[PDB]
Design a protein around this nucleic acid. Structure first.
Ligand SMILES: [Mg+2]
Ligand SMILES: [Mg+2]
Ligand SMILES: [Mg+2]
Ligand SMILES: [Mg+2]
Ligand SMILES: [Mg+2]
Ligand SMILES: [Mg+2]
Ligand SMILES: [Zn+2]
Ligand SMILES: [Zn+2]
Lengths: 47, 168, 38, 37, 43, 221, 59, 142, 162, 97
RNA sequence: ACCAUAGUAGGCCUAAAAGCAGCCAUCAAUUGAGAAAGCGUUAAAGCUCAACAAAUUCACCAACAUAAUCCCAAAAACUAAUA
């Protein structure tokens, strides 16, 4: 069956290089997201 | 629909193929090839038991013979080499053979150097313990294609004519 | 001759030669060892 | 009775390597079972 | 004179179509954007 | 030139009955009840019999397959006449066939029911050993005539030693720590990037796209 | 200098030019090498012809 | 046309096999060799079959060289036994000393093969010990 | 470069060796530490079948290849050079090094077709009658894949098939 | 020494080789010497005598072979390689005789 | 590439078993050559492997016929592309 799937936590654990790559501050989380929809809904499951 | 397992290898949906083409193995690619880099560091070979046995054996062989005559090895029947051995056994003279590989580094050390150009081709070392030259050249007179190349006699190297002279 | 997917030297005198964009096995001792890659 | 073990002959003696040759040979004698031309 | 059996893209036998270098690119591009995404979603 | 020390086997313990045992056409308690065919039992990596027991040699399965009786006959005959019962012995690393397979005769309209029992077969997962051979032999001979046996198997298969096998597994993980491209199948499958999970089957999360249907691709990192 | 065309690869050997009379068994396959041998002009003319849009003005 | 190795018993030379099939195929006279070979070997009353080397020439005449009799026989006689052990080394047949092997050594030092070989009696002795160990006869040094 | 000379004189025959002067490797290699003759001159992944001035340095007067052990090239560059030599030849370059045969210049055949980047021999290739549609194509081979490592100023990987 | 024995050397009168041991270039003429001194080459003909002349003084390696076409073959070793002198031996002395 | 003798046609079986129908031993001459991996003989004899000796080293894990009206864009190695 095809399903809701899921993500294993380890994915979201950032490595120290990535702060340098994406220009994040290792110390302080940014406050607000800008989100944009890059691709389309259609052909993806209703949820 | 085809079952998840088939005989015939089962065409993949495109996007999965795309996924493959992206996930292909990529081997680490060198800056400079290791082979076209300068030579590898240095791997010393070491003396075997055979190398030591032949070094000891040769160190004794230049000691005990008073006349060591280089005779270029030449193709004969087993009959003729056995016969030449026995006719070497009537005057008591000895014949020994040594590999050029371990024979070369020994005479390239100090004293015997003049014997190096002689051992390039095939060779057969004639051991004469308390020798007489005319008896040695005697059987070499019998077979015309079997040359005597001279060399070491009691620390003095001599060619064919030096031997023709020591005989008379 | 024969045409084959797989060559093998069938003897000592068998040898392996590339002619006309193919592989050949040629044998002087026996003709019967002659093979041709397909 | 007969000499068997090759570990009992000195690697500095000329007659030790004779059995080493004989064994290297028997090795090749074995590997040639499957070789058929 | 070389034919495809049945329907083009459908059955147990299909028109073979290969991946393009273009395709490799597009996919990587998306992967890039999403690596960045799951970074910004971390902390 | 140069002599080297020969490998000697003072440790080789040769059992009685070195030859392969006779495997049976049918079980002694023939399954009365027709079974579903789990094709999944051929699908993906083997769990069991991945490793050696007694010997240093084996025929290793590089695809998943189905072994029926004929094959066993091939192996038994071939291996037995190709070995010296003095210096070698062989082993079954695989059971005798237990798994029914069904047929309807010719000219059957579809359905009406299940057919009757034609076969018996043994499923092999890729990564398993069919036959274990120990002995005082060097690998080269065993290899020589065992590749014959391998090649005639239903799936692609190989002949291997402890050395050879560990060589290739070591290599296998090495390839995957040496990989230059940032993008691995695992990486994307677990993280469901590109919503790829729509296209992937759940088993793939384990198989990491190395196993496909019954096939195995070792080149797949 | 049409006769003096260069053909990369072995293309001289494997590129074939086909045409049909329309008569049964009237079908003709010709190695590029042969064709050019017979008529120097052909090779290039076919390249250019096959390279234009397919409407009338090509003619 | 070639050479023939023929191991033949002392007083026995007969116009039948092995001398019929082996010598008679080369085109060689069987009676001539029976007379010559018996002429030489009737003079051994020690009854020892000797391996003999028969050179067979292009024109169908021939020439002979008598070698020393087989070690199989000298040690068959030395241990007093008859036929050597069935499985050799598993089973003992007969026995010899450092003297036995010495006798059989110096008797055989004049062999066609050991003659041109200047090897001391130690060598020929280890040779006869070697021919002993597969014959099933054990050595005891006293 | 040792010329072997033979003389027929009055029912006696003299055969003897005579040494000519071997030109020497130019003074100053860019990668002196480098190993293979190619690699110390910085020539790897540069020379193509189109470089004669490089190529003619290893070959024989009658056009064939040199033995590698004499040239001592990294096996790879040996095979590369080999292919490029055959290619350049088929390309009708190095007309000098064709073997000299006084009778054979006379018998005209149609003026040799000018070709280049030819991987196979002209006699072996079978004409492909069947083309094939877009999903199964028969690709006419160009250049040798051995050269697939030459640097691309374009970034476009060289096209080996059409 | 196969290439020589295969060719039926019986057309040869006498083979003599004059060479000078202590020079550094003498290897090839020796390779020729032990090539022709082989047993098969030796017993292909009983009319061929081989005589090996050894000199410290001569300084010039050479080989002289005569044969019954009235031909006198003189190959002068200086820089000549072994397989070459044997090749010329092969093409010269066989095709003529 | 070269080269090939020795106890010894090793015991036992066998019409003969001679290294090479089958069981035993795996011995020891020569500096070096298995009581022999191939072939061969009725048994031989006879050919090659390995053994020295001379050398050079560059390697290994090979390949797979065709259809029925007429082949199926034409073409093309490179002036710069996160187009
Ligand atoms: Mg489905
Ligand atoms: Mg359709
Ligand atoms: Mg379909
Ligand atoms: Mg298979
Ligand atoms: Mg010995
Ligand atoms: Mg014999
Ligand atoms: Zn053959
Ligand atoms: Zn290089």
């Amino acid at each position: 069956k095809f399903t809701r799937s899921r993500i294993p936590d380890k994915v979201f654990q950032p490595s120290p290089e990535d702060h340098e790559k994406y220009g994040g501050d290792p110390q302080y989380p940014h406050k607000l997201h800008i989100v944009t929809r890059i691709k389309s809904t259609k052909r993806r499951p209703y949820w | 629909g085809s079952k998840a397992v088939t005989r015939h290898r089962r065409v993949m949906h495109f996007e999965r193929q795309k996924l493959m083409a992206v996930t292909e193995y990529i081997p680490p690619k060198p800056t400079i090839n290791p082979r076209c880099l300068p030579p590898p560091p240095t791997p010393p070979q070491e003396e075997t038991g055979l190398v030591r046995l032949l070094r000891r054996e040769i160190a004794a062989v230049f000691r005990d013979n008073r006349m060591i005559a280089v005779c270029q090895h030449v193709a004969l029947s087993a009959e003729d080499k056995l016969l030449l051995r026995h006719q070497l056994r009537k005057h008591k003279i000895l014949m020994k053979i040594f590999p050029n590989q371990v024979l070369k580094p020994f005479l390239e050390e100090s004293k015997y150097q003049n014997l190096l150009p002689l051992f390039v081709g095939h060779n057969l070392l004639l051991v004469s313990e308390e020798p007489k030259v005319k008896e040695m050249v005697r059987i070499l007179k019998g077979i015309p294609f079997l040359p005597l190349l001279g060399g070491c006699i009691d620390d003095t190297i001599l060619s064919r004519q030096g031997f023709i002279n020591y005989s008379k | 001759f024969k045409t084959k997917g797989v060559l093998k030297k069938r003897c000592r005198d068998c040898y392996l030669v590339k002619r006309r964009g193919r592989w050949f096995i040629y044998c002087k001792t026996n003709p019967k060892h002659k093979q041709r890659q397909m | 009775g007969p000499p068997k073990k090759l570990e009992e002959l000195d690697p500095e003696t000329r007659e030790y390597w004779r059995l080493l040759r004989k064994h290297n040979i028997w090795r090749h004698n074995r590997l040639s079972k499957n070789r058929k031309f | 004179r070389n034919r495809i059996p049945g329907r083009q893209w459908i059955g147990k036998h299909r028109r073979p179509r290969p991946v393009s270098a273009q395709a490799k690119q597009n996919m990587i591009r998306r992967l890039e954007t999403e690596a960045e995404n799951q970074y910004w979603l971390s902390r | 030139k140069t002599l080297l020390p020969v490998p000697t086997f003072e440790d080789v313990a040769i059992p009685e009955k070195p030859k392969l045992r006779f495997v049976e056409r049918v079980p002694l308690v023939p399954k009365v009840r027709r079974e579903r065919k789990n094709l999944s039992d051929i699908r993906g990596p083997s769990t069991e019999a991945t490793e050696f027991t007694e010997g240093r040699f084996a025929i290793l399965a590089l695809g998943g397959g189905y072994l029926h009786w004929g094959h066993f006959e091939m192996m038994r005959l071939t291996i037995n006449r190709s070995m010296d019962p003095k210096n070698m012995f062989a082993l079954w690393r695989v059971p005798a066939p237990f798994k029914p397979i069904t047929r309807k005769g010719m000219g059957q309209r579809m359905g009406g029911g299940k057919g009757a029992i034609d076969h018996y077969v043994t499923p092999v997962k890729a990564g398993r050993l069919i036959v274990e051979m120990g002995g005082r032999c060097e690998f080269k001979e065993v290899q020589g005539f065992l590749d014959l046996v391998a090649h005639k198997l239903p799936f692609p298969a190989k002949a291997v030693s402890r050395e050879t096998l560990e060589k290739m597994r070591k290599d296998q993980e090495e390839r995957e720590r040496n990989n230059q491209n940032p993008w691995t199948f695992e990486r994307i499958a677990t993280a469901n990037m590109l919503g790829i999970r729509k296209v992937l089957s759940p088993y793939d999360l384990t198989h990491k796209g190395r196993y496909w249907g019954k096939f195995y691709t070792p080149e797949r990192v | 200098n049409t006769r003096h065309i260069a053909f990369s690869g072995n293309k001289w050997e494997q590129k074939v030019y086909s045409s049909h009379t329309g008569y049964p068994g009237g079908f003709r396959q010709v190695t590029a090498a042969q064709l050019h041998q017979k008529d120097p002009v052909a090779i290039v003319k076919l390249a250019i012809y096959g390279m234009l849009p397919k409407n009338l003005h090509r003619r | 046309s070639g050479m023939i190795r023929a191991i033949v018993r002392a007083g026995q030379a007969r116009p039948g096999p092995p001398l019929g099939p082996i010598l008679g195929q080369r085109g060689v006279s069987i009676n001539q060799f029976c007379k010559e070979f018996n002429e030489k070997t009737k003079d051994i009353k020690e009854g020892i079959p000797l391996p003999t080397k028969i050179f067979v020439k292009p024109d169908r005449t021939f020439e002979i060289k008598i070698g020393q009799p087989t070690v199989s026989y000298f040690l068959k006689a030395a241990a007093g036994i008859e036929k050597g052990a069935r499985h050799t080394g598993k089973e003992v047949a007969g026995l010899v000393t450092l003297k036995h092997v010495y006798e059989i050594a110096r008797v055989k030092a004049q062999d066609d093969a050991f003659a041109l070989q200047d090897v001391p009696l130690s060598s020929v002795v280890r040779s006869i010990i070697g021919s002993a160990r597969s014959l099933g006869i054990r050595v005891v040094k006293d | 470069f040792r010329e072997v000379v033979e003389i027929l004189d009055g029912k006696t025959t003299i055969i003897e060796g005579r040494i000519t002067e071997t030109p020497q490797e130019s003074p100053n290699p860019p990668n002196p530490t480098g190993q293979c003759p190619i690699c110390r001159w910085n020539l790897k992944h540069k020379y193509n079948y189109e470089d004669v001035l490089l190529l003619s340095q290893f070959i024989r007067p009658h056009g064939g290849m040199l033995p590698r052990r004499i040239t001592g090239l990294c096996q790879e560059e040996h095979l590369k050079i080999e292919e490029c030599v055959k290619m350049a030849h088929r390309a009708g370059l190095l007309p000098n090094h064709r073997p000299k045969l006084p009778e054979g210049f006379v018998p005209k055949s149609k003026p040799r077709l000018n070709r280049y980047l030819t991987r196979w021999s002209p006699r072996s290739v079978k004409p492909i009658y069947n083309k094939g549609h877009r999903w199964n194509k028969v690709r006419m081979p160009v250049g040798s894949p051995l050269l697939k490592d030459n640097v691309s100023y374009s970034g476009r990987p060289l096209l080996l098939y059409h | 020494a196969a290439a020589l024995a295969r060719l039926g050397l019986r057309a040869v009168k006498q083979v003599r080789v004059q060479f000078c041991p202590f020079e550094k270039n003498v290897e090839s003429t020796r390779t020729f010497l032990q090539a022709v001194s082989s047993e098969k080459v030796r017993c292909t003909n009983l009319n061929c005598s081989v005589i090996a002349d050894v000199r410290h003084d001569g300084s010039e390696p050479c080989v002289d072979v005569l044969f019954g076409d009235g031909h006198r073959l003189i190959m002068r070793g200086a820089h000549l390689t072994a397989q070459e002198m044997l090749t010329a031996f092969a093409s010269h002395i066989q095709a003529r005789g």
